[PDB]
From Swiss-Prot, chain A:
Assembly description: Component of the RNA polymerase I and RNA polymerase III complexes consisting of at least 13 and 17 subunits, respectively. Pol I complex consists of a ten-subunit catalytic core composed of POLR1A/RPA1, POLR1B/RPA2, POLR1C/RPAC1, POLR1D/RPAC2, POLR1H/RPA12, POLR2E/RPABC1, POLR2F/RPABC2, POLR2H/RPABC3, POLR2K/RPABC4 and POLR2L/RPABC5; a mobile stalk subunit POLR1F/RPA43 protruding from the core and additional subunits homologous to general transcription factors POLR1E/RPA49 and POLR1G/RPA34.
Function in brief: DNA-dependent RNA polymerase catalyzes the transcription of DNA into RNA using the four ribonucleoside triphosphates as substrates. Common component of RNA polymerases I and III which synthesize ribosomal RNA precursors and short non-coding RNAs including 5S rRNA, snRNAs, tRNAs and miRNAs, respectively. POLR1C/RPAC1 is part of the polymerase core and may function as a clamp element that moves to open and close the cleft.
Name assigned to this protein: DNA-directed RNA polymerases I and III subunit RPAC1
From-to range in the entire protein, with total length: 150 to 198 of 346
Subcellular localization: Nucleus; Nucleus, Nucleolus; Cytoplasm, Cytosol
Family according to the record: Belongs to the archaeal Rpo3/eukaryotic RPB3 RNA polymerase subunit family.
Swiss-Prot record, chain B:
Quaternary structure and interacting proteins, as annotated: Component of the RNA polymerase III complex consisting of at least 17 subunits: a ten-subunit horseshoe-shaped catalytic core composed of POLR3A/RPC1, POLR3B/RPC2, POLR1C/RPAC1, POLR1D/RPAC2, POLR3K/RPC10, POLR2E/RPABC1, POLR2F/RPABC2, POLR2H/RPABC3, POLR2K/RPABC4 and POLR2L/RPABC5; the stalk composed of two subunits POLR3H/RPC8 and CRCP/RPC9, forming a structural mobile part that protrudes out of the core and functions primarily in transcription initiation; and additional subunits homologous to general transcription factors of the RNA polymerase II machinery, POLR3D/RPC4-POLR3E/RPC5 heterodimer and POLR3/CRPC3-POLR3F/RPC6-POLR3G/RPC7 heterotrimer.
Function (record text): DNA-dependent RNA polymerase catalyzes the transcription of DNA into RNA using the four ribonucleoside triphosphates as substrates. Specific peripheric component of RNA polymerase III (Pol III) which synthesizes small non-coding RNAs including 5S rRNA, snRNAs, tRNAs and miRNAs from at least 500 distinct genomic loci. Assembles with POLR3D/RPC4 forming a subcomplex that binds the Pol III core. Enables recruitment of Pol III at transcription initiation site and drives transcription initiation from both type 2 and type 3 DNA promoters.
Superkingdom field: Eukaryota
First-to-last residue of the parent protein present: 305 to 354 of 708
Transmembrane segments: none
Name of the protein this chain belongs to: DNA-directed RNA polymerase III subunit RPC5
Cell location: Nucleus
Species, as recorded: Homo sapiens (Human)
From Swiss-Prot, chain C:
Keywords: DNA-directed RNA polymerase, Metal-binding, Nucleus, Transcription, Zinc
Organism in which the protein naturally occurs: Homo sapiens
Upper taxonomic lineage: Eukaryota, Metazoa, Chordata, Craniata, Vertebrata
Subunit structure: Component of the RNA polymerase I (Pol I), RNA polymerase II (Pol II) and RNA polymerase III (Pol III) complexes consisting of at least 13, 12 and 17 subunits, respectively. Pol I complex consists of a ten-subunit catalytic core composed of POLR1A/RPA1, POLR1B/RPA2, POLR1C/RPAC1, POLR1D/RPAC2, POLR1H/RPA12, POLR2E/RPABC1, POLR2F/RPABC2, POLR2H/RPABC3, POLR2K/RPABC4 and POLR2L/RPABC5; a mobile stalk subunit POLR1F/RPA43 protruding from the core and additional subunits homologous to general transcription factors POLR1E/RPA49 and POLR1G/RPA34.
One GO cellular component term noted in the UniProt record for this chain: RNA polymerase II, core complex
Pfam families noted in UniProt: RNA_pol_N
Biological process per Gene Ontology, one example term: tRNA transcription by RNA polymerase III
Role description: DNA-dependent RNA polymerase catalyzes the transcription of DNA into RNA using the four ribonucleoside triphosphates as substrates. Common component of RNA polymerases I, II and III which synthesize ribosomal RNA precursors, mRNA precursors and many functional non-coding RNAs, and a small RNAs, such as 5S rRNA and tRNAs, respectively.
InterPro entries in the cross-refs: RNA_pol_su_RPB10, RNA_pol_suN_Zn-BS, RPABC5/Rpb10
Name of the protein in its database record: DNA-directed RNA polymerases I, II, and III subunit RPABC5
Transcription found in the keyword field: yes
Chain positions recorded as Zn(2+) binding sites: C7, C10, C44, C45
Length: 49, 50, 65
């Protein structure tokens, strides 16, 4: 919603235009939330495009 | 061709950088033109080249 | 089309090292020293990054949007 008039680079024009693997969110099933502390279950590299 | 006339002509289409002459941005990019790579208006290209 | 996630031969994660690689090319780095700085020792990952063509943005230029 807020960008420069030109904004040639896609970074300024767009948001979430690169789906990095950090967007993956773990959805616990059953009691997996209690067994695994938060942040343990996640993609390893966090930066894969 | 006399040097004064050439200097007058080049002062209208070029600028002096480090003793050399570089064509003006608007000459390369007409007002109706756009970037072949991004499609941005020629005014932004002129500002960037300036 | 897009950078593969894994190296074909060895299997090292190479997908996350693409955009940073471009940064090293946006900087003054050459190809070889940028690949060395990224940590690609064996030549297979160097072939993966060096020979990859980024067609995803050119295709996105033709996306509906
Ligand atoms: Zn490899």
């Amino acid at each position: 919603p807020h960008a420069a008039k030109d904004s040639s680079d896609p970074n300024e024009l767009y948001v979430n235009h690169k789906v990095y693997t950090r967007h993956m969110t773990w959805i616990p099933l059953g009691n997996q939330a209690d067994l695994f502390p938060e942040g343990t279950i996640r993609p390893v590299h966090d930066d894969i495009l | 061709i006399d040097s004064v006339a050439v200097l007058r002509g080049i002062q209208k289409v070029a600028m002096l950088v480090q003793g050399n002459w570089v064509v003006k941005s608007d000459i390369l990019y007409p007002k109706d033109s756009s970037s072949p790579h991004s499609g941005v208006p020629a005014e932004v290209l002129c500002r960037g080249r300036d | 089309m897009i950078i593969p996630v894994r190296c074909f031969t060895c299997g090292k994660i190479v997908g996350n090292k693409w955009e940073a690689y471009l940064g090293l090319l946006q900087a003054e780095y050459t190809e070889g020293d940028a690949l060395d700085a990224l940590g690609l020792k064996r030549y297979c990952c160097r072939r993966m990054l060096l020979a990859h063509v980024d067609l995803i943005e050119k295709l996105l230029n033709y996306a509906p949007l």
